[PDB]
Design a protein around this motif. Structure first.
Motif, PDB file in Angstrom:
ATOM      1  N   UNK A   2      57.006  70.113  15.619  1.00  0.00           N
ATOM      2  CA  UNK A   2      55.615  69.689  15.513  1.00  0.00           C
ATOM      3  C   UNK A   2      54.798  70.138  16.729  1.00  0.00           C
ATOM      4  N   UNK A   3      55.386  70.084  17.919  1.00  0.00           N
ATOM      5  CA  UNK A   3      54.862  70.775  19.085  1.00  0.00           C
ATOM      6  C   UNK A   3      55.688  72.039  19.308  1.00  0.00           C
ATOM      7  N   UNK A   4      55.017  73.184  19.417  1.00  0.00           N
ATOM      8  CA  UNK A   4      55.730  74.417  19.728  1.00  0.00           C
ATOM      9  C   UNK A   4      54.943  75.236  20.736  1.00  0.00           C
ATOM     10  N   UNK A   5      55.679  75.854  21.660  1.00  0.00           N
ATOM     11  CA  UNK A   5      55.114  76.769  22.641  1.00  0.00           C
ATOM     12  C   UNK A   5      54.234  77.808  21.962  1.00  0.00           C
ATOM     13  N   UNK A   6      53.042  78.016  22.512  1.00  0.00           N
ATOM     14  CA  UNK A   6      52.069  78.897  21.927  1.00  0.00           C
ATOM     15  C   UNK A   6      51.005  78.197  21.104  1.00  0.00           C
ATOM     16  N   UNK A   7      51.299  76.994  20.588  1.00  0.00           N
ATOM     17  CA  UNK A   7      50.343  76.247  19.770  1.00  0.00           C
ATOM     18  C   UNK A   7      49.552  75.239  20.605  1.00  0.00           C
ATOM     19  N   UNK A  45      41.400  59.485  28.792  1.00  0.00           N
ATOM     20  CA  UNK A  45      42.221  59.264  27.611  1.00  0.00           C
ATOM     21  C   UNK A  45      43.648  59.729  27.833  1.00  0.00           C
ATOM     22  N   UNK A  46      43.840  60.816  28.577  1.00  0.00           N
ATOM     23  CA  UNK A  46      45.189  61.176  28.985  1.00  0.00           C
ATOM     24  C   UNK A  46      45.812  60.024  29.763  1.00  0.00           C
ATOM     25  N   UNK A  47      45.156  59.617  30.845  1.00  0.00           N
ATOM     26  CA  UNK A  47      45.683  58.554  31.694  1.00  0.00           C
ATOM     27  C   UNK A  47      46.182  57.378  30.875  1.00  0.00           C
ATOM     28  N   UNK A  48      45.365  56.916  29.930  1.00  0.00           N
ATOM     29  CA  UNK A  48      45.723  55.748  29.138  1.00  0.00           C
ATOM     30  C   UNK A  48      46.932  55.976  28.234  1.00  0.00           C
ATOM     31  N   UNK A  49      47.386  57.214  28.045  1.00  0.00           N
ATOM     32  CA  UNK A  49      48.526  57.475  27.176  1.00  0.00           C
ATOM     33  C   UNK A  49      49.822  57.712  27.945  1.00  0.00           C
ATOM     34  N   UNK A  50      49.787  57.653  29.279  1.00  0.00           N
ATOM     35  CA  UNK A  50      50.891  57.856  30.210  1.00  0.00           C
ATOM     36  C   UNK A  50      51.358  56.528  30.807  1.00  0.00           C
ATOM     37  N   UNK A 165      44.750  75.504  20.279  1.00  0.00           N
ATOM     38  CA  UNK A 165      45.563  75.158  19.132  1.00  0.00           C
ATOM     39  C   UNK A 165      45.321  73.767  18.569  1.00  0.00           C
ATOM     40  N   UNK A 166      44.122  73.207  18.744  1.00  0.00           N
ATOM     41  CA  UNK A 166      43.868  71.814  18.380  1.00  0.00           C
ATOM     42  C   UNK A 166      42.611  71.682  17.523  1.00  0.00           C
ATOM     43  N   UNK A 167      42.633  70.732  16.590  1.00  0.00           N
ATOM     44  CA  UNK A 167      41.505  70.563  15.686  1.00  0.00           C
ATOM     45  C   UNK A 167      40.276  70.112  16.462  1.00  0.00           C
ATOM     46  N   UNK A 176      42.773  62.999  21.207  1.00  0.00           N
ATOM     47  CA  UNK A 176      44.059  62.365  20.987  1.00  0.00           C
ATOM     48  C   UNK A 176      45.161  63.394  20.869  1.00  0.00           C
ATOM     49  N   UNK A 177      44.905  64.516  20.184  1.00  0.00           N
ATOM     50  CA  UNK A 177      45.890  65.582  20.156  1.00  0.00           C
ATOM     51  C   UNK A 177      46.143  66.083  21.556  1.00  0.00           C
ATOM     52  N   UNK A 178      45.073  66.249  22.327  1.00  0.00           N
ATOM     53  CA  UNK A 178      45.208  66.661  23.714  1.00  0.00           C
ATOM     54  C   UNK A 178      46.007  65.637  24.512  1.00  0.00           C
TER      55      UNK A 178
END
Ligand SMILES: COc1ccc(-c2oc3cc(-c4cccc(OC)c4)ccc3c2CC(=O)O)cc1
Length: 188
Positions: A2-7, A45-50, A165-167, A176-178
């Motif tokens: 679902x996560x792949x290098x390059x995407x 938003x990153x911070x809050x997911x770590x 590579x994100x919508x 959120x994808x980020x």
């Protein structure tokens, strides 16, 4: 996978040892950086997911804006030395990109003055060797990954975020994808 290098991310050819867990590079001249900060609030938003122990580091870069570009990197060092990133990030972004009233080192200083930092503290920090070092650290970190574009984010000196590579039909889905990606990399 679902996560792949390059995407969602790329992998560094030569990794960087001793780098911070999450490392962001930005420029107050950078149009996408204005969006990440004011519209999308990427860092927050990153911070809050770590986990709470993870250290986020954000650095300014020289390669946009010529003379002001470097002035801004020194000023960001002042901001970090004094701990007032949260007081000056928005006015710095709007001074450079919205009102375009930041056109010299003196206007940058005005931002800090209006934001509550005393003239003496600013000028003392501006000219300090502590700040010179913080300028060198910002430059060094950027040099380590041959940074030619911002906004950029690296995880454990090994992985680089690939926002292409994100919508982007929806601002919220995009961040959120980020953010979910940063979390996934933080766990590889
Ligand atoms: C290191 O170099 C780069 C740094 C950033 C980008 C990049 O920034 C972006 C911002 C947005 C955005 C921002 C605010 C609201 C908004 O609405 C939903 C969307 C959307 C996509 C991108 C992309 C990817 C691309 O261009 O495909 C590319 C290259």
């Amino acid at each position: 996978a679902q996560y792949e290098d390059g995407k969602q991310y790329t992998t560094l050819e030569k990794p960087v040892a001793g780098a911070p867990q999450v490392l962001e590079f930005f420029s107050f001249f950078c149009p996408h950086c204005y969006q990440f900060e004011e519209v999308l609030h990427i860092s927050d938003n990153v911070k809050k997911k770590l986990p709470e122990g993870v250290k986020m580091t954000k650095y300014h870069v020289n390669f946009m804006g010529g003379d002001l570009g470097k002035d801004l990197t020194q000023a960001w060092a002042v901001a970090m030395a004094l701990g007032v990133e949260d007081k000056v990030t928005v006015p710095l972004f709007e001074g450079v990109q919205k009102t375009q009233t930041i056109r010299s080192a003196s206007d940058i200083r005005d931002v800090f003055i209006n934001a509550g930092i005393k003239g003496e503290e600013y000028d003392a920090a501006w000219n300090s060797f502590v700040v010179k070092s913080l300028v060198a650290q910002q430059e060094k970190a950027a040099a380590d990954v041959q940074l030619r574009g911002v906004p950029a984010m690296f995880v454990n000196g090994k992985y680089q975020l690939n926002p292409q590579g994100m919508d982007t039909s929806n601002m919220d889905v995009f961040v959120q994808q980020y953010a979910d990606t940063v979390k996934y990399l933080s766990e590889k």
